Swiss-Prot record, chain C:
Modified residues (N6,N6,N6-trimethyllysine): 55
Stated name of the protein: Histone H2B type 1-J
Modified residues (Dimethylated arginine): 49
Organism, scientific name: Homo sapiens (Human)
Record localization: Nucleus; Chromosome
Gene: H2BC11
Curated annotation (Swiss-Prot), chain F:
Coiled coil regions in record: none
Function description: Core component of nucleosome. Nucleosomes wrap and compact DNA into chromatin, limiting DNA accessibility to the cellular machineries which require DNA as a template. Histones thereby play a central role in transcription regulation, DNA repair, DNA replication and chromosomal stability. DNA accessibility is regulated via a complex set of post-translational modifications of histones, also called histone code, and nucleosome remodeling.
Sequence positions bearing N5-methylglutamine: 94
Keyword NADP: no
Residues of the full protein shown: 12 to 120 of 130
Cellular localization per UniProt: Nucleus; Chromosome
Biased composition (Basic residues): 1-8
PTM-bearing positions, type N6-(beta-hydroxybutyryl)lysine: 26
Entry's Gene Ontology BP terms: heterochromatin formation
The protein, known as: Histone H2A type 1
Primary localisation category: nucleus
Gene Ontology CC terms, in alphabetical order: nucleosome; nucleus
Keywords assigned by UniProt, alphabetized: Acetylation, Chromosome, Citrullination, DNA-binding, Hydroxylation, Isopeptide bond, Methylation, Nucleosome core, Nucleus, Phosphoprotein, Ubl conjugation
From Swiss-Prot, chain G:
Tissue expression from the record: Specifically expressed in the seminiferous tubules of testis.
Modified sites of kind N6-glutaryllysine: 13, 72, 79
Processing after translation: Acetylation is generally linked to gene activation. Acetylation at Lys-79 (H3K122ac) by EP300/p300 plays a central role in chromatin structure: localizes at the surface of the histone octamer and stimulates transcription, possibly by promoting nucleosome instability. H3R2me2a is present at the 3' of genes regardless of their transcription state and is enriched on inactive promoters, while it is absent on active promoters.
Name used for this protein in its record: Histone H3.3C
Full-protein interval shown: 44 to 134 of 135
Family from the record: Belongs to the histone H3 family.
Native source species: Homo sapiens (Human)
Sequence positions bearing N6-lactoyllysine: 13
Residues bearing the modification N6,N6,N6-trimethyllysine: 13
Subunit structure: The nucleosome is a histone octamer containing two molecules each of H2A, H2B, H3 and H4 assembled in one H3-H4 heterotetramer and two H2A-H2B heterodimers. The octamer wraps approximately 147 bp of DNA.
Gene: H3-5
Localization, UniProt: Nucleus; Chromosome
Modification sites for Phosphoserine: 14, 43
From Swiss-Prot, chain H:
Residue positions where N6-glutaryllysine is found in the record: 9, 37, 55, 57, 69
Sequence positions bearing N6-(2-hydroxyisobutyryl)lysine: 9, 22, 37, 55, 57, 69
Cross-link (Glycyl lysine isopeptide (Lys-Gly) (interchain with G-Cter in SUMO2)): 9, 37, 57, 69
Modification sites for N6-(beta-hydroxybutyryl)lysine: 9, 55, 69
Range within the parent protein: 24 to 103 of 103
Gene assigned in the entry: H4C1
Glycyl lysine isopeptide (Lys-Gly) (interchain with G-Cter in ubiquitin) crosslink site(s): 69
GO cellular-component term (any): nucleosome
Provenance organism: Homo sapiens (Human)
Similarity-based family: Belongs to the histone H4 family.
Residues carrying N6-propionyllysine: 9, 22, 55, 57, 69
Cross-link Glycyl lysine isopeptide (Lys-Gly) (interchain with G-Cter in UFM1): where in chain: 9
Molecular-function GO term, any one: DNA binding
Name of the protein: Histone H4
Residues where N6-acetyllysine is found: 9, 69
Length: 82, 90, 95, 106, 85, 109, 91, 80
DNA sequence: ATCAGAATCCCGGTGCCGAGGCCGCTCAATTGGTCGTAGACAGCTCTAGCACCGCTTAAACGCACGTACGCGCTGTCCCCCGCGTTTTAACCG
């Protein structure tokens, strides 16, 4: 289904990366908040990144717009474009 | 005992554990839910998944650092809130 | 304008001058290009900020030297300012 | 032929690339001109520093290839570089190959 | 300045320290918006700050819903400005 | 005779457009600036200042004080979660926050 | 530790400075000379610097205190500040 | 000497009595003091450079505001 | 749960020095014409954007047994809190 995919993002991957991060055990109340705040953060990131692209009368979200949006957010990451 | 083997193996490899197609689909769905009929680059999706991966691994390293600080390894949601509140984004 | 400008090729030229055998990867190439473009925009923004604030409707040498000093640590920028002042005096004197 | 400033200045980095910005961007009526060579030199010397640091970091693991993992390792071994980009984290950073006493057995 | 505040709240005084605080606040907000608009012009190769530049910067700055209401009010205000005399 | 008016006022605003327009032109950002854009900036600044002053005044009236002080401004900023999101990078003298104290500080029995 | 939370509330309401003229003044003066001698500092600016310093101190110490609550009951340690600083990125 | 004693022990104790910390330590005061020197030195150095570009050798309110805006975490001072 | 104690929250009187406000002026805000110039809309090249498919299976999800640890109680000692008193210095002028 191409809707209501909040349950789509998977916790096992976060658990495995935490294991890579040293963590040997996690809890059940953690992901309850972690997933919610992750969804809130993703919503905000997508909103400001697509707001950034709207200036140049473009329809597709470009790499440099996303990188500069994260730069304005203070949580920047570098990649191919930018 | 296998934790040592897993640590060495994950130090030897660096594959992106979050997959490009589910996160791509999630981004498409959420973007079309906010503003309908807009396109999204594949490179932008890869950059966004990299940003999210870096954010979560940094957060979990901070969580582990706080855990071992309080002579523990398993952690409670309070540590995550702690990290977000010291970073101030919450 | 149609030609996709890249800034990693200049780094590649310096690298070939130093160690042409070894090199960088594609994702890493993207990383350094984004770093170069980000630093380029940051120094442009620093020049714009200084020019706005001090009512500085010009930017010859002192302004961008102050921008370099603000961007970078004190000692490294001071040495860079020294060699930059020498270079600009030599360039003006030579012609 | 055509006497460009690259050979005269002895610098491989592009000179008037900044002049493009200054001209078309119309930033001010008195902007740049001398700014190009200055920032080009600063960027060149910073890139030389970063190249040296990355090369030093790469040789620690008896490998002679450059990966952004090693860039993260070199940056995180520098406290000043950390303070420059404290609100930044580079992907694939992971953890260091030195293992603390907390994880190892007795 | 101060005239507007006395119109909306005549019974509230204000010291000059607060007036300077809001003056520095609007100075910083204007500086950030102007710099962001200049960067957006550089990225899209523009030598003239038009309505779209400042509108995109304003929507980027404040959160979505309030930004949308503010730009709607700005649109109705500019239509009033251009239509009246 | 022509009526030389402030172009913000014709749009229903109060902030004079001349100073910010001069700062934009003299700031070495762009030599050409349109007329509508500083009007939009004036409108946004007026709305934001009016909103924060009204919220601070309501909080101060709740706080049993007739006039505004920086503490009331801090409480007004911390009251709205969106303002904490955006204006969280700036604080004002003698900062404050809602009673988020726990129950582990007091000695246990 | 129990009257301390009451004192926390008391200092929470307080909205005045503490060490402006004789002290902090001598401090900034000293540091100024250390960098470049014959410097001065506006009284209003002095007040602004003191309030910014004390506000940042309040925030960072609150962060370190909530990190110290994770170590059981109530006790601060140097490692608390060090760790928190590193996590945030200051260290 | 008096450079480290510019801020007293009960001064940091008051900053802890308004900054959450209920239990303090001797070494904590020293750490917080060193962090304060780092912060103050950064701001004063930035102000020195900015008041050297315009050849003034003294900071005004606006100078302090621009110096602290360079640190990322901006602040709004008095006057302007 | 329940009464007494220390600190705290709001209010009253006074010093004042920075706030509330009047006036000029001058340097800036406005109005009006030019027009080459630079942003908005139709069109060329063509790249990758939305959605799904052949085939294998790594991994997500659900479930079974149990151990390292989550959380709480107990011993300690040392190491910082509570309070009286002195000096000493912060803000005042």
């Amino acid at each position: 289904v191409l809707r209501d995919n909040i349950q789509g993002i998977t916790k096992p991957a976060i658990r495995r990366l935490a294991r890579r991060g040293g963590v040997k055990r996690i809890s059940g109340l953690i992901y309850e908040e972690t997933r919610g705040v992750l969804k809130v953060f993703l919503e905000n990131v997508i909103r400001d990144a697509v707001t950034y692209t709207e200036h140049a009368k473009r329809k597709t979200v470009t790499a440099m717009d996303v990188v500069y949006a994260l730069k304005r957010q203070g949580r920047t990451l570098y990649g191919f474009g930018g | 005992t296998v934790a040592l083997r897993e640590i060495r193996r994950y130090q030897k490899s660096t594959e992106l554990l979050i997959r490009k197609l589910p996160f791509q689909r999630l981004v498409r769905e959420i973007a079309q839910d906010f503003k309908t009929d807009l396109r999204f680059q594949s490179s932008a999706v890869m950059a966004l998944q990299e940003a999210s991966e870096a954010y979560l691994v940094g957060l979990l390293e901070d969580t582990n650092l706080c855990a071992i600080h309080a002579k523990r390894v398993t952690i409670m949601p309070k540590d995550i809130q702690l990290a977000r509140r010291i970073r101030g984004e919450r | 304008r149609s030609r996709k400008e890249s800034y990693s090729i200049y780094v590649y030229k310096v690298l070939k001058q130093v160690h042409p055998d070894t090199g960088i990867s594609s994702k890493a190439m993207g990383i350094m290009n984004s770093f170069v473009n980000d630093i380029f925009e940051r120094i442009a923004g620093e020049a714009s900020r200084l020019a706005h604030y001090n009512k500085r409707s010009t930017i010859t040498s002192r302004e961008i030297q102050t921008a370099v000093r603000l961007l970078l640590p004190g000692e490294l920028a001071k040495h860079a300012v020294s060699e930059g002042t020498k270079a600009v005096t030599k360039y003006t004197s030579s012609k | 032929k055509a006497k460009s400033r690259s050979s005269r200045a002895g610098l491989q980095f592009p000179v008037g690339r900044v002049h493009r910005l200054l001209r078309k961007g119309n930033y001010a009526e008195r902007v740049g001109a001398g700014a190009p060579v200055y920032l080009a030199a600063v960027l060149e010397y910073l890139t030389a520093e970063i190249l040296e640091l990355a090369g030093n970091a790469a040789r620690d693991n008896k490998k002679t290839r450059i990966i952004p993992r090693h860039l993260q390792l070199a940056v995180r071994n520098d406290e000043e570089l950390n303070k420059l980009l404290g609100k930044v984290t580079i992907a694939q950073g992971g953890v260091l190959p030195n293992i603390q006493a907390v994880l190892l057995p007795k």
